[PDB]
């Protein structure tokens, strides 16, 4: 019955290909729109690299203008994220971008690749976005259609007053598209004044279909140029960093992400399972690239991190120091632990920077030093990349 | 630096493509090898469709041979799964297969397709495997490389005394292979005398790579014939049912599973998210099939189930009765609830049939009536399929 079943299939293809899917409605039906825990002026000091005197002066200037700061039950300052950014601009420090010896840069395009909880790229975006001396313009793009990565960091929906919401692949396969268009309709603001977001929707699955059947008509290899030529290039003006999050699969989606991407970052854990998948990955991961039209700009760096670490199991060391001595540098000294706190983030769709003893500090100190450590490398290669 | 980075890539491709991966070791490092809760003789009565008299007679015959049954702290029978199968054969009922008006059958090849917790195919396998009057020979094949589906139902490892362990794609791309080979080395026994298992390993990821680059050399479409011609056909002798579990992605893996597969089953939930992905799926799901060499045997049936149901939220009804009235029959009346119990299965990698008030019964009655209800349909179409 080969024929008859196809016929029922299109019958359901076109019967159902008219039912439903109000997207603004469900993003709106998810707004967990809560915001950030205000800083202490000790914490604002740490995150800013401002002296209490330069900071207090910045306050006083903002207060001698209209501004009124909220205050404690102990009448202690409670500075918001917005307040902290403006405090910077009041202290007369200019954004990372601003310091002009780096203002002709090209933007980092880090392609994170979760090999199995796909929530480390979001901690990076928040820690890098949560460094107020620099105040990077970042962008965290979700590319896994099975991604909750806009449940974390829910965009300011900013209302039903939003036409439509597009994902990356909605701008690859589309719907005239310009950076004015992408700002107004596909990149959304998120609770971190300087971290914007680009969500994905399980519909984004279509892509692969059209890819794997858009090669029948071609052993071509112009299908990996779509996200660069259609979207990333059209938003590299406004951004210092870009992170494209893909999780585990082979794909023309993650393919479409590697070609536009000029560095790789591979979160993994002590586990031999994710470890083992990953070396299969690498073994499969040269042709992987060889394939896109030679105009591919190579990679700058590529590195991996240890995620979810037990530094009490003699057993997990017995894979991470295989990693250490297997790979030395090109791994990260920052072993993020397991942490009750990290995992109620996965429960509650927050990041450790959203909540108010016994993980908090080492949860965030873990991420913050892994983001500091991440941070060195990017500066190391920004020169070469910039070429 | 296009060239230089590829060169480092193969450098890591071949540097690392010699490190590690002792598979028997890790399956062995996982044996959660515990077994089933023994039945009551009330429960053995329910699962068997034996009268207490025919059952007690079967016991007495087994006891008048050597056998010794374990007993209760209240000296009440505690029949194991093995004991129950032999009790059947002692009661002189023949296996489903056995009843010869269905012994020239062809085996069901249900392709389950999890659209987002990928643990319903395992409840089906256990409920269908846990019907002792029939005693189906089933096979639950994992095809998602991100599958825990051998952590559930850990095979009798039966020891390090096992050469190697192969997955489906290890027998697609291989390593001379015959049904004697597949029995001795790739299908493993599991705690249900009549449910065997075929695991997958995240290495299985390779497949896609070779597929999507094994079409550059061909707009061919012989790559979907691999799992049928290489594995399934070579084990259809020994099986009454076959379930191939794939979860969400487009793929030549799930492709390779649809072509060898002669019915479809699509678990989904009240949620508009998984609901929405699925209708995109259907809209993409005719060409999907149109593509394999015409010799494709069509589908027999195709249906969906409701999984994880809140019958207290007026809100979830407000999608499942859209489903009901949208789709009527070709859905299942058996709405599996949310259930604390179902979700500690996902916690503990069991199925509801593994544990000992307030879900148990409705958890299993839910699965059992969805498996009963599943059960009717398969009989309905077995005739036509058999053609």
Residue numbers in the entry:
A (entry chain A), B (entry chain A): 4 to 119, 124 to 182, 188 to 368, 376 to 406
Show the paper's wording:
Bacterial cells use several evolutionarily-distinct genome segregation systems, the most common of which is the type I Par system. It consists of an adapter protein, ParB, that binds to the DNA cargo via interaction with the parS DNA sequence; and an ATPase, ParA, that binds nonspecific DNA and mediates cargo transport. Each chromosome encodes its own segregation complex, with Chr1 encoding a chromosomal type Ib system, and Chr2 encoding a plasmid-like type Ia system. In this study, we have reported the structure of the ParA2vc protein, in three states: apo, nucleotide-bound (ADP) and in a filamentous complex with nucleotide and DNA.
The purified protein crystallized readily, and the obtained crystals diffracted to ~2.5 Å. The obtained ParA2vc crystal structure includes one ParA2vc molecule per asymmetric unit. The overall structure of the ParA2vc monomer is similar to that of P7 ParA, with an overall RMSD of 2.2 Å for CA atoms. In particular, the N-terminal HTH domain resembles that of P1 and P7 ParA, confirming that ParA2vc belongs to the type Ia family. No ligand density was observed in the active site, confirming that this structure corresponds to the apo state of the protein. It is worth noting that the nucleotide-binding site is generally poorly resolved, and in particular we were not able to build the P-loop in this structure. One of the symmetry-related pairs is consistent with a biological dimer, and largely resembles the P7 ParA dimer structure. This suggests that we have obtained the structure of the ParA2vc dimer through crystallographic symmetry. Comparing the ParA2vc dimer to that of the P7 ParA structure confirms that they possess a similar architecture, with helix 1 forming a domain-swapped interaction with the adjacent subunit. Overall, this structure confirms the common architecture of ParA proteins, and is consistent with the fact that the V. cholerae chromosome 2 is plasmid-like, as suggested previously, since the ParA2vc structure confirms that it belongs to the type Ia family.
